[PDB]
Structure formats: structure tokens, C-alpha cells
Design goal:
The structure is a homotrimer. Chain A is mostly loops and about 60 residues long. Chain A is about 0% helix and about 5% strand. Chain A is built from no helices and one strand. The N and C termini of chain A lie far apart (about 60 Å). Chains in contact: A-B, A-C, B-C. Chains B and C meet through loops of B and loops of C. Strand 1 of chain A pairs parallel with strand 1 of chain B, so a sheet runs across the interface. Chains A, B, C: Belongs to the synuclein family. Chains A, B, C: This is Alpha-synuclein. Chains A, B, C: It is found in: Cytoplasm; Membrane; Nucleus; Synapse. Chains A, B, C: It comes from Homo sapiens (Human). It is classed as protein fibril.
């Protein structure tokens, strides 16, 4: 059971992600795998996860 | 059971992702695989995941 | 059971992530795998996780 009146509720929100990058450089080399990324924004109300970022085996 | 009145609710929202990039450089080389990305925005209300980013095996 | 009146509630919110980067450099080399990332923002109301970032085996 649940009830509201005038209730300006806010549940599971995000607000603003400024992410100015600049003159970077990223020279991955001789690897098994890179998973370089950038921004990421998620928002839920009933969930079992969020942004997963997995690499894996390598060798030479 | 659930009920509302005048309830200006907000559930599972996102608001704004400014992502100005610039003069980058990303020279992946001799890998098994790169998964470089950029922005990513998700938003749910009942979920079992979000942006997954997986690489995998390599070698030389 | 649950009830509200005029209740300007706020549950599970985020507010603002300024992330000015600059002239970085990241030369991963001779690895099994890198999982370099950048920003990450999550927000929930009933959850069993958040941004997981896993690497894995390497070798030479």
C-alpha cells in the first residue's frame, strides 16, 4: 500500500554531467585487449546492475 | 496497491550530459581487440542491466 | 503502508559531476588487458550493484 497528495516526489534521478576533455593521448600497445571508455550515466528505479566494463585474457 | 493526487512524480530520469571532447588521439596497436567508446546514457524503471562493454582474448 | 502530504521528497538522486580533464597521457603496454575508463555516474532506488570494472588474466 502507498498513497500521496501534492507530493512532488523525485526517485532515481540524475542531473548534469559536464565532462570537458582535452588534448589527451592513449596509445595502448601489445595487449590482449583494452576497454578504454569515456562518459557513462545510468539511472534506475529497481535494478540488478549498471555499467559493467570487463576486459579479458591476454598473452605474448 | 498505489494511488496519487496532484503528485508531480519523477521516476527514473536523466537530465543533461555535456561532453565536449577535443583534439584527442588514440592509437591502439597490436592488440586482440579494443572497445574504445564515447558517451553513453541510459534510463530505466525496472531493469536487469545497463551499458556493458566487454573485450576478449588476444595473442601474439 | 506509507503515506505523504505536501512531502517534497527526494530519494536516490545525483546532482552534478564536473570532470574537466586536460593534456593527459596513458600508454598501457605489454599487458594482458587494461580497463582504463573515465567518468561514471549511477543512481538507484532499490538495487544490487553499480559500476563494476574488472580486468583479467595476463601473461608473457
Amino acid at each position: 500500500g502507498v498513497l500521496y497528495v501534492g507530493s512532488k516526489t523525485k526517485e532515481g534521478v540524475v542531473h548534469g554531467v559536464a565532462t570537458v576533455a582535452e588534448k589527451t593521448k592513449e596509445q595502448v600497445t601489445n595487449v590482449g585487449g583494452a576497454v578504454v571508455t569515456g562518459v557513462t550515466a545510468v539511472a534506475q528505479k529497481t535494478v540488478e546492475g549498471a555499467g559493467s566494463i570487463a576486459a579479458a585474457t591476454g598473452f605474448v
